[PDB]
Amino acid sequence: KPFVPKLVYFEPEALSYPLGKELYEKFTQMGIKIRETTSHNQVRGIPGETELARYRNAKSTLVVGVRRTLKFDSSKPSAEYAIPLATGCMGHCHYCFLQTTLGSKPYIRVYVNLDDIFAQAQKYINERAPEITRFEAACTSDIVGIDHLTHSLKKAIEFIGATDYGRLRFVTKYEHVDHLLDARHNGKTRFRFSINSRYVINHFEPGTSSFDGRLAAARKVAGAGYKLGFVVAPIYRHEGWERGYFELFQELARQLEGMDLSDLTFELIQHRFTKPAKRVIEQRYPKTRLDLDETKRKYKWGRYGIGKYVYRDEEAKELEDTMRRYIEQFFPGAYVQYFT
Numbered sequence: 001k002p003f004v005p006k007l008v009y010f011e012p013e014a015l016s017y018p019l020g021k022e023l024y025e026k027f028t029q030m031g032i033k034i035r036e037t038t039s040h041n042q043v044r045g046i047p048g049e050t051e052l053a054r055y056r057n058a059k060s061t062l063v064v065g066v067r068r069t070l071k072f073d074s075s076k077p078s079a080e081y082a083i084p085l086a087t088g089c090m091g092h093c094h095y096c097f098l099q100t101t102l103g104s105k106p107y108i109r110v111y112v113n114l115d116d117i118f119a120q121a122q123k124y125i126n127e128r129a130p131e132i133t134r135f136e137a138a139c140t141s142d143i144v145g146i147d148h149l150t151h152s153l154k155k156a157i158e159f160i161g162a163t164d165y166g167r168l169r170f171v172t173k174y175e176h177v178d179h180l181l182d183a184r185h186n187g188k189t190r191f192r193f194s195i196n197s198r199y200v201i202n203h204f205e206p207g208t209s210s211f212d213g214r215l216a217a218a219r220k221v222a223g224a225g226y227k228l229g230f231v232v233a234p235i236y237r238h239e240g241w242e243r244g245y246f247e248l249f250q251e252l253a254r255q256l257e258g259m260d261l262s263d264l265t266f267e268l269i270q271h272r273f274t275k276p277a278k279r280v281i282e283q284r285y286p287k288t289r290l291d292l293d294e295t296k297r298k299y300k301w302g303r304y305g306i307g308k309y310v311y312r313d314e315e316a317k318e319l320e321d322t323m324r325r326y327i328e329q330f331f332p333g334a335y336v337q338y339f340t
């Protein structure tokens with residue numbers, strides 16, 4: 001059940017780096033179909049005659065390449081920067097915001113030039129020291145879910161752990177965290193898990209680990225001394241959401257009881273979608289229950305790209321207030337970092 005690609009592309013230059021060489025050896029030994037591509041942003045010949053087929057096959061394709069854009073993007077409100085270790089995901093979350101993100105690809109990409117990437121992270125750390133600089137590693141990917149294949153996140157964790165002013169964070173929907181339990185994190189990595197109501201997970205989150213898997217993973221991670229956090233997102237106003245989310249937090253407190261939760265964090269993100277979401281999501285997930293009715297929403301305009309639909313102010317406040325009551329009830333002295 002850990003992700004293993006059924007098709008793999010390599011950039012030729014990728015073989016010049018340890019990880020690229022190691023992955024080429026791994027997959028050729030596994031007898032998996034391997035191909036060459038000039039650029040990891042330009043992958044041709046993924047199988048499928050329909051768009052739906054090409055999309056689903058892309059989600060089973062791994063692309064191994066070199067990160068050439070060594071400017072890191074901002075990753076607010078989570079962190080100062082997105083550290084680029086991977087992009088894309090094997091999951092099929094109906095609502096996934098990566099589906100309509102500019103220039104995102106459906107296939108999973110891993111970058112092999114870690115020396116370059118971490119060196120650049122250090123330069124960013126230096127530029128702001130002694131202020132703390134936080135890096136998000138799961139900004140455009142499920143970095144944790146992919147990591148059993150590469151150990152890139154484990155290396156980033158140990159890199160950041162050796163710094164004085166750097167911090168690392170990431171959020172996952174996957175339970176496959178065993179290889180990370182002995183990482184020398186040094187208290188500088190926040191290990192988060194995406195949680196939601198039974199309704200949302202059951203209807204919209206196929207291809208991911210279950211709620212119990214995520215919580216089992218959370219207990220391991222915490223027991224290994226990682227700082228622990230949860231991302232309650234997408235907060236979705238389905239029929240019976242009030243009770244649904246009440247039961248989430250009740251079940252969450254029960255599955256974590258005994259443990260010290262004095263440094264536990266929460267992040268709250270309401271369901272958002274873009275103007276092209278309807279056409280894209282319907283083509284890929286035609287049986288979905290996902291409500292993309294724009295008329296009931298408030299549009300937030302884009303800045304340099306296009307904007308997004310969020311719930312109307314009064315609906316969003318209602319969601320925020322309710323979630324904050326639940327977190328106060330079941331997790332007193334846990335910090336809500338933001339609602340957006």
Ligand SMILES: C[Se@@+](CC[C@H](N)C(=O)O)C[C@H]1O[C@@H](n2cnc3c(N)ncnc32)[C@H](O)[C@@H]1O
Nearest residue numbers: 095096097138142171172194233234270271272
């Ligand atoms: C893009 Se997700 C990358 C990290 C990892 N693969 C993971 O899923 O946790 C980051 C978070 O954002 C949420 N999220 C995704 N799409 C939306 C959305 N459309 N509206 C509102 N939230 C959305 C997901 O539930 C995650 O909690």
Ligand code: SF4
Nearest residue numbers: 089091092093096173
């Ligand atoms: S696990 Fe995260 S990145 Fe993967 S499809 Fe689901 S929301 Fe998107």
